[PDB]
Design an enzyme around this catalytic site. Structure first.
Site, PDB file in Angstrom:
ATOM      1  N   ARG A  79     -29.278   2.324 -31.586  1.00 52.12           N
ATOM      2  CA  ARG A  79     -28.683   1.612 -32.710  1.00 52.12           C
ATOM      3  C   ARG A  79     -27.502   0.781 -32.242  1.00 52.12           C
ATOM      4  O   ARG A  79     -26.678   1.234 -31.445  1.00 52.12           O
ATOM      5  CB  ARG A  79     -28.205   2.570 -33.793  1.00 52.12           C
ATOM      6  CG  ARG A  79     -28.109   1.887 -35.175  1.00 52.12           C
ATOM      7  CD  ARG A  79     -28.083   2.913 -36.269  1.00 52.12           C
ATOM      8  NE  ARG A  79     -28.164   2.385 -37.628  1.00 52.12           N
ATOM      9  CZ  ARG A  79     -28.501   3.124 -38.683  1.00 52.12           C
ATOM     10  NH1 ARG A  79     -28.795   4.415 -38.539  1.00 52.12           N
ATOM     11  NH2 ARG A  79     -28.549   2.581 -39.889  1.00 52.12           N
ATOM     12  N   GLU A  82     -42.060   4.079 -32.600  1.00 50.64           N
ATOM     13  CA  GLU A  82     -42.131   5.523 -32.803  1.00 50.64           C
ATOM     14  C   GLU A  82     -42.949   5.895 -34.029  1.00 50.64           C
ATOM     15  O   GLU A  82     -43.554   6.972 -34.066  1.00 50.64           O
ATOM     16  CB  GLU A  82     -40.730   6.112 -32.976  1.00 50.64           C
ATOM     17  CG  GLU A  82     -39.827   6.055 -31.765  1.00 50.64           C
ATOM     18  CD  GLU A  82     -38.580   6.901 -31.951  1.00 50.64           C
ATOM     19  OE1 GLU A  82     -38.411   7.474 -33.049  1.00 50.64           O
ATOM     20  OE2 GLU A  82     -37.770   6.998 -31.003  1.00 50.64           O
ATOM     21  N   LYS A 121     -37.814   3.079 -47.020  1.00 45.25           N
ATOM     22  CA  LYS A 121     -36.576   2.802 -47.736  1.00 45.25           C
ATOM     23  C   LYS A 121     -36.901   2.240 -49.112  1.00 45.25           C
ATOM     24  O   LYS A 121     -37.758   1.363 -49.244  1.00 45.25           O
ATOM     25  CB  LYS A 121     -35.704   1.797 -46.969  1.00 45.25           C
ATOM     26  CG  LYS A 121     -35.607   2.054 -45.461  1.00 45.25           C
ATOM     27  CD  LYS A 121     -34.995   0.873 -44.721  1.00 45.25           C
ATOM     28  CE  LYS A 121     -34.851   1.169 -43.229  1.00 45.25           C
ATOM     29  NZ  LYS A 121     -34.232   0.041 -42.480  1.00 45.25           N
ATOM     30  N   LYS A 136     -40.352   1.707 -36.782  1.00 42.49           N
ATOM     31  CA  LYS A 136     -39.217   2.439 -36.220  1.00 42.49           C
ATOM     32  C   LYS A 136     -39.177   2.151 -34.723  1.00 42.49           C
ATOM     33  O   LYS A 136     -39.916   2.758 -33.943  1.00 42.49           O
ATOM     34  CB  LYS A 136     -39.343   3.931 -36.504  1.00 42.49           C
ATOM     35  CG  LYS A 136     -38.098   4.741 -36.179  1.00 42.49           C
ATOM     36  CD  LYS A 136     -38.302   6.201 -36.541  1.00 42.49           C
ATOM     37  CE  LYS A 136     -37.038   7.015 -36.355  1.00 42.49           C
ATOM     38  NZ  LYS A 136     -36.657   7.140 -34.923  1.00 42.49           N
ATOM     39  N   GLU A 168     -31.481  -2.384 -34.058  1.00 43.42           N
ATOM     40  CA  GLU A 168     -31.878  -1.583 -32.910  1.00 43.42           C
ATOM     41  C   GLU A 168     -31.919  -2.484 -31.684  1.00 43.42           C
ATOM     42  O   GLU A 168     -32.572  -3.533 -31.702  1.00 43.42           O
ATOM     43  CB  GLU A 168     -33.248  -0.936 -33.127  1.00 43.42           C
ATOM     44  CG  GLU A 168     -33.582   0.147 -32.111  1.00 43.42           C
ATOM     45  CD  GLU A 168     -32.882   1.461 -32.411  1.00 43.42           C
ATOM     46  OE1 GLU A 168     -32.036   1.489 -33.326  1.00 43.42           O
ATOM     47  OE2 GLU A 168     -33.183   2.469 -31.739  1.00 43.42           O
ATOM     48  N   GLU A 184     -41.009   0.091 -42.560  1.00 42.27           N
ATOM     49  CA  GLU A 184     -40.632  -0.717 -41.411  1.00 42.27           C
ATOM     50  C   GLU A 184     -40.967   0.023 -40.125  1.00 42.27           C
ATOM     51  O   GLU A 184     -40.855   1.250 -40.060  1.00 42.27           O
ATOM     52  CB  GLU A 184     -39.134  -1.058 -41.434  1.00 42.27           C
ATOM     53  CG  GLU A 184     -38.716  -1.852 -42.656  1.00 42.27           C
ATOM     54  CD  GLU A 184     -37.236  -2.185 -42.677  1.00 42.27           C
ATOM     55  OE1 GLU A 184     -36.481  -1.623 -41.863  1.00 42.27           O
ATOM     56  OE2 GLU A 184     -36.826  -3.015 -43.517  1.00 42.27           O
TER      57      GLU A 184
HETATM   58  O1  LIG Z   1     -34.772   9.859 -35.396  1.00 39.05           O
HETATM   59  P1  LIG Z   1     -33.692   9.294 -36.283  1.00 39.05           P
HETATM   60  O2  LIG Z   1     -33.322  10.039 -37.539  1.00 39.05           O
HETATM   61  O3  LIG Z   1     -32.331   9.118 -35.467  1.00 39.05           O
HETATM   62  O4  LIG Z   1     -34.191   7.837 -36.684  1.00 39.05           O
HETATM   63  C1  LIG Z   1     -33.280   6.855 -37.165  1.00 39.05           C
HETATM   64  C2  LIG Z   1     -32.948   5.841 -36.100  1.00 39.05           C
HETATM   65  O5  LIG Z   1     -34.072   4.965 -35.899  1.00 39.05           O
HETATM   66  C3  LIG Z   1     -33.618   3.703 -35.444  1.00 39.05           C
HETATM   67  N1  LIG Z   1     -34.424   2.654 -36.076  1.00 39.05           N
HETATM   68  C4  LIG Z   1     -35.417   1.948 -35.458  1.00 39.05           C
HETATM   69  N2  LIG Z   1     -36.018   1.055 -36.252  1.00 39.05           N
HETATM   70  C5  LIG Z   1     -35.354   1.207 -37.460  1.00 39.05           C
HETATM   71  C6  LIG Z   1     -35.505   0.565 -38.698  1.00 39.05           C
HETATM   72  N3  LIG Z   1     -36.425  -0.401 -38.913  1.00 39.05           N
HETATM   73  N4  LIG Z   1     -34.693   0.936 -39.707  1.00 39.05           N
HETATM   74  C7  LIG Z   1     -33.778   1.894 -39.496  1.00 39.05           C
HETATM   75  N5  LIG Z   1     -33.553   2.562 -38.371  1.00 39.05           N
HETATM   76  C8  LIG Z   1     -34.372   2.179 -37.360  1.00 39.05           C
HETATM   77  C9  LIG Z   1     -32.109   3.624 -35.729  1.00 39.05           C
HETATM   78  O6  LIG Z   1     -31.380   3.450 -34.536  1.00 39.05           O
HETATM   79  C10 LIG Z   1     -31.795   4.934 -36.470  1.00 39.05           C
HETATM   80  O7  LIG Z   1     -30.603   5.510 -35.941  1.00 39.05           O
END
Ligand SMILES: *OP(=O)(O)OC[C@H]1O[C@@H](n2cnc3c(N)ncnc32)[C@H](O)[C@@H]1O
Ligand SMILES: [Mg+2]
EC number: 6.5.1.1
Length: 639
Positions: free
Chosen positions: A311, A458, A463, A306, A359, A304
């Site tokens: 969050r 990013e 998953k 990122k 997000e 997916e």
């Molecule tokens: O850098 P990190 O470990 O905090 O990354 C996790 C965070 O990334 C955000 N995020 C964005 N898009 C997604 C998707 N598709 N699935 C899960 N997390 C995602 C989240 O906010 C997470 O904290």
DNA sequence: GCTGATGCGTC
DNA sequence: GTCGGAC
DNA sequence: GTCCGACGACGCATCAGC
């Protein structure tokens, strides 16, 4: 009973009743807690720390059950449930003022020693009383005094906080002031945190069950078991607590239940529910696609986008109320009046309750485009009125944790994702499902990774879909994987920057440099411009090398051609000479750093997002460092 | 009230 | 957020 | 892998000196 200053929760064959330093039903003395912290601080093996804390908790349960909750919060250095948002509002400046007043020392002397030793606690306890001591500090007393500090607000509140902090120090003895000061500075430094506290608590209530008539007939249950049977039993009991806590990370709710009903029945009373924040699923970083495939080699997985926002865990309660929490269980409901008003529009009429993992991403409604994280952070935070919103956001939903009265944490992601797509409605620029790809093909993943960045993300989250694909944080908190271009070697934006200053280390870095000030070379004005600080990426051995090599370059005064503008003034100015290879995830528009000011923005320079040390460039002089013009170019191709 | 500093949050 | 140390 | 605490940029909300 014995004096708490001799309490030893690290002794062999610790007896919860005989080896406690307070009498049954009496308040737990804070010095018993401080003595436990000392014994934790003194070891490096975390499991030894758990056992030591477990011993204290067994005595608390056996002797003074009302003090279990404050003792646990003190061990976590928390003020309470995170969603309630209590904050000390005390910085090291204020704390050092209280220490200097309590110890009868001049402030600059105190500040200099705290910088040198990298610990305010070491200054507080190492510094002729016309007054007899006040009553001893108690665990619940200290905890409530911390919360008193946190509630003080408004003009003149810092003076009242200093009064409370001074009163604590005047009452301290032995090692208490050390851990009072460390707690107030937000750096307890035990080496023991949430997972160790959970392990100590489940072990404690398993060996010394609560609710027993005193003296407790059962003080060390499972001593007669085999090592393997005892270990297996404690893991099972540990998992009951962990799984409850990850669904309900609120000790105000869990501890009264645990004491009244016991650990086995705890899950029947404390259940995941909308309106109660829960722990989010996290992700491990990866070095590339090959590592992803290895870690998931026995499981189909999905990739997916990122998204680069914040969050938002969205709770829709039965009856219509909506709550929104951050990834650390802070209450963000008052921040998103616009999102609250659009909940009816994202879900089918048949949906009565839910918990969504999303997000929140800043969204340009005129250009129909994702906006950078730095735009999202300009939204107001508290009690926002919907009409006032200027930065709109779009929700990218990627998981579904609870639906219509039923928790899905134990369902595989394939089912959770299917229920999300079936029951929720997409609206462009408002509520959208995360773009995804189901594949094991290296090339398709690499192209998808490239596309996510082109589409303003990013990188990728990865998953599993069916195997070990649940939302059970207690089984594995980092069950997902993240893949970013800057994790790859020879890939990402790398810069060669000049070390122009160093900062004294704290905690694990006491006695050497914990951070450094870096600069790019401005050809036009013939000046080095601070661009960022740097405090991660070097081994302990590398950091000793830096301390030694940079020690020889310390200057009394800054060089006239080094510009730092708003950056923190280094503790030690360094003769500009060392050039380091530095990697970052992105370049940001900075309100303090002068690097490349005027090349992209009239009033702002440029800094680095997530900078980390890679290696020394012994082949580079400062004149061969990355130039400020090059920094501007790198920033511009971010688009 | 004006101004600059900063605690705590987000990443 | 990234990262490395202890296990 | 898990757990932990060193450290990064940066911006809203709110603090004190004056
Ligand atoms: O850098 P990190 O470990 O905090 O990354 C996790 C965070 O990334 C955000 N995020 C964005 N898009 C997604 C998707 N598709 N699935 C899960 N997390 C995602 C989240 O906010 C997470 O904290
Ligand atoms: Mg908080």
């Amino acid at each position: 009973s014995n004096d708490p200053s001799g309490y030893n929760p690290a002794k062999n064959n610790y007896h919860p009743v005989e080896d406690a330093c307070w009498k049954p039903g009496q308040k737990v003395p804070y010095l018993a807690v401080a003595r436990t912290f000392e014994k934790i601080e003194e070891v490096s093996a975390r499991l030894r720390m758990v056992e030591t804390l477990s011993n204290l908790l067994r005595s608390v349960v056996a002797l003074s059950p009302p003090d279990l909750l404050p003792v646990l919060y003190l061990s976590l250095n928390h003020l309470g449930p995170p969603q309630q948002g209590l904050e000390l509002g005390v910085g090291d400046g204020v704390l050092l003022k209280a220490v200097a007043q309590a110890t009868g020392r001049q402030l600059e002397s105190v500040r200099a020693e705290a910088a040198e030793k990298g610990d305010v606690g070491l200054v507080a306890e190492n510094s002729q009383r016309l007054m007899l001591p006040p009553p001893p500090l108690t665990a619940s007393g200290v905890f409530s005094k911390f919360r008193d500090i946190a509630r003080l607000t408004g003009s003149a509140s810092t003076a009242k906080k200093i009064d409370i902090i001074k009163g604590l120090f005047v009452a301290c003895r032995h090692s208490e002031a050390r851990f009072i000061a460390r707690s107030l500075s937000g750096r307890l430094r035990l080496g023991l945190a949430e997972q160790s506290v959970l392990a100590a608590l489940s072990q404690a209530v398993s060996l010394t069950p609560p609710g027993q008539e005193f003296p407790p007939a059962m003080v060390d249950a499972g001593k007669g078991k085999t090592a393997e049977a005892r270990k297996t039993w404690l893991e099972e009991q540990g998992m009951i607590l962990k799984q409850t806590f990850c669904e309900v990370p609120d000790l105000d709710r869990i501890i009264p239940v645990l004491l009244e009903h016991g650990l086995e029945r705890l899950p029947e009373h404390c259940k995941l529910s909308p309106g109660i924040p829960l722990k989010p699923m996290l992700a491990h970083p990866t070095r590339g696609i090959s590592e992803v495939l290895k870690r998931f080699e026995e499981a189909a997985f999905t990739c997916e986008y990122k998204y680069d926002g914040q969050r938002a865990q969205i709770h829709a309660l039965e009856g219509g109320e909506v709550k929104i929490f951050s990834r650390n269980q802070e209450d963000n409901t008052g921040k998103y009046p616009d999102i609250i008003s659009r909940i009816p529009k994202i879900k089918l009429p048949s949906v009565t309750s839910f918990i969504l993992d999303t997000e929140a991403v800043a969204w340009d409604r005129e250009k129909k485009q994702i906006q950078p994280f730095q735009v999202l952070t300009t939204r107001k935070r508290k009690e926002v009125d919907a009409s006032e919103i200027q930065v709109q956001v779009c929700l990218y939903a990627f998981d579904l944790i609870y639906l219509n009265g039923e928790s899905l944490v134990r369902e595989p992601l394939s089912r959770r994702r299917q229920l999300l797509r079936e029951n929720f409605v997409e609206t462009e620029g408002e509520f959208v499902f995360a773009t995804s790809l189901d594949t094991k093909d290296i090339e398709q993943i690499a192209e998808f990774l490239e596309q996510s960045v082109k589409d303003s993300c990013e990188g990728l989250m990865v998953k599993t879909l069916d195997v070990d694909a649940t939302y059970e944080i207690a089984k594995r908190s980092h069950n997902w994987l993240k893949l970013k271009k800057d994790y790859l070697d020879g890939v990402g934006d790398t810069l060669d920057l000049v070390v122009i200053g160093a900062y004294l280390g704290r905690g694990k870095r006491a006695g050497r440099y914990g951070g450094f000030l870096l600069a790019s070379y401005d050809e036009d004005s013939e000046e080095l411009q601070a661009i960022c600080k740097l405090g991660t990426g070097f081994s302990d051995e590398e950091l000793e090398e830096h301390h030694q090599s940079l020690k020889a370059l310390v200057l009394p005064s800054p060089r006239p051609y080094v510009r730092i503008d708003g950056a923190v003034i280094p503790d030690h100015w360094l003769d500009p000479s060392a050039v380091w290879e530095v990697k970052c995830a992105d370049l940001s528009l900075s309100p303090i750093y002068p690097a490349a000011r005027g090349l992209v923005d009239s009033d702002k320079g440029i800094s680095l997002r997530f900078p980390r040390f890679i290696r020394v460039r012994e082949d580079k002089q400062p004149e061969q460092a990355t130039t400020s013009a090059q920094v501007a170019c790198l920033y511009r191709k971010q688009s």
